[model samples]
Each structure stands twice: as structure tokens, then as C-alpha cells.
Target: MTLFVLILSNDKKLIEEARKMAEKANLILITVGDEEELKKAIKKADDIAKKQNSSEAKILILLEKPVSPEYEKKLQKYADAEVRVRTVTSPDEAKRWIKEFSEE
Candidate 1:
């Protein structure tokens, strides 16, 4: 199983925290700063999901602020049942969110 982390923030602290979390969990981290990066992350996540063959690939998108409904809809278009997308408030929150999936 793979946890594909897509971070959408410019904050250094948040980004670093997310990186640390992903490294600790041994997840595939994809940090995106703009629309282009987001597109790339989505494609990569989908590919990983397809190759996993057993479990769905999880995508945790850490956004500094909440986005609009239209943006959400657009984001949803790139994801399928096999590639789940989740939005979180910050890197710290994202760390806690992913804690469950982490192995000791």
C-alpha cells in the first residue's frame, strides 16, 4: 500500500513537517506548489493506485486554507475510488491524520 501525500502550501514549516511525517511513514510524498504540480501529483497517485493491485492509494492534500466548491469539484474529477483524496488544515493536522496509517 502507498500513501501519496500532496501538499498545497508555501509555508516552510508545514512543508517540512509533512515531509518528515511522510518519511517516517515511508509514504510516497508529492509536494505541489501550483496547479501544474497538482496535476502531476494526481497522475502519479492514480498510477500508484493502479499498480498497488490490492489497496487504494491514499492522497492527503494539506491546504493552508479551504478552497471553493468549484475547486473541490475539479479536484474530485482527478480522483477515483481507487485514489482517495483528503484535505487537511495544516501539516501538524496532516501528521495526526496520517498517524493511523503509520506503522510502529
Candidate 2:
């Protein structure tokens, strides 16, 4: 099994809908206000990965803005060997990413 982690902000109605799709697929959804909160969410995901041991952890970062390289560097610690970071531009993309994991 694969663990799909969704990191999203509060500004998008599409992301909210995508969150429900993720829930239906049994993905992890973490809503955040800032990079600090994002780090906390990643930490939580990392903890789950360690606990589950049976799943691969992946991340989908749904944001309209560019991400900071510094933040990306910080995320390295929590990301697993196969961690994937996707910039979700549409609700369909979000659902697709989660569904891909579900099929695996």
C-alpha cells in the first residue's frame, strides 16, 4: 500500500473537494496556514510512515505560489525514499494523484 499525503491551504474550494476525494481513497489530508505548519504536517506523516512500515509515503503540495527551496530542503528529512511532491493545479489532478496510489 502507498500513503498519499495531501498538503493544502484554505484558499481553494477545489482543494476542499479534493480533500474529500482523498478521504474516499483513504489518503492523509493536512491543512496548513504556513510553512511552519506544513513542516508539522510532514512530521506527522513521517511518524505515520514509521508506524505503518507497510506503506510508501508520498506528498502532494497544492498551492498557487512557488515553494521555497529552504522549505523543500527542510522537508527532505521527513520524506521517504520514494516521496513525491506534486503541485496540484486542479481538483482533477489531486484526485488523480490519490487514485493512482489507491490503485497500487
RMSD to the true structure for each prediction, in A, is 3.4, 3.2
- Pick out the ten consecutive residues of candidate 1 with the lowest summed lDDT: 79-88
Best by lDDT: 1
Segments in model 1 whose C-alpha atoms lie over 4 Å from true places: 67-77, 81-90, 100-104
What are the models' TM-scores? 0.70, 0.70
lDDT, candidate 2, 10-91, per-residue tens: 5466767778887776777777767677777777767777777525556655554566766555565466624455566777
Q: Name every residue pair that clashes in candidate 2.
A: none
Report clash pairs, candidate 1: none
